[PDB]
Amino acid sequence: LYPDLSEIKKEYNVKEKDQVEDLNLDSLWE
Numbered sequence: 294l295y296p297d298l299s300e301i302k303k304e305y306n307v308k309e310k311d312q313v314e315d316l317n318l319d320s321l322w323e
Contacts (some may be wrong), residue, residue, distance in 0.1 A: 297303045 299306065
């Protein structure tokens, strides 16, 4: 329940992932 209580930690926690998953599900598909 409630927010992620992060939403600027999460996005910070995701931006780092939203920048790598590619190189795993896009870097080896290239």
